[PDB]
Design goal:
Layout (H helix, E strand, L loop, with lengths): L1 H20 L5 H14 L2 H25 L1
Helix pairs in contact: 1-3
C-alpha cells in the first residue's frame, strides 16, 4: 500500500546516513529511530515520497504489461 511504499523508498535512500550518524545502533533501535524521523518529517516531504513511490509503481505496472 502507499504509506508502506513511501516509507520504504525514503528509508532505503536514507539508511546509510542515519546509520553513519548513529554508530553501533542495533537493528531494533534503527527501526525505532527511523520511525521517529519519519514522524518528525513534514507532511509535504512525506507526500513527496508517496509521489515518488506512485511513479515507480506505475512504471512497474507498465513494464509488467510489456513482460506479460
Amino acid at each position: 500500500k502507499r504509506p508502506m511504499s513511501a516509507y520504504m523508498l525514503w528509508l532505503n535512500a536514507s539508511r546509510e546516513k542515519i546509520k553513519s550518524d548513529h554508530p553501533g545502533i542495533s537493528i531494533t533501535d534503527l527501526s525505532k529511530k527511523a520511525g521517529e524521523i519519519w514522524k518528525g518529517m513534514s507532511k509535504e516531504k512525506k507526500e513527496e515520497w508517496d509521489r515518488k513511490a506512485e511513479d515507480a509503481r506505475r512504471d512497474y505496472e507498465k513494464a509488467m504489461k510489456e513482460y506479460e
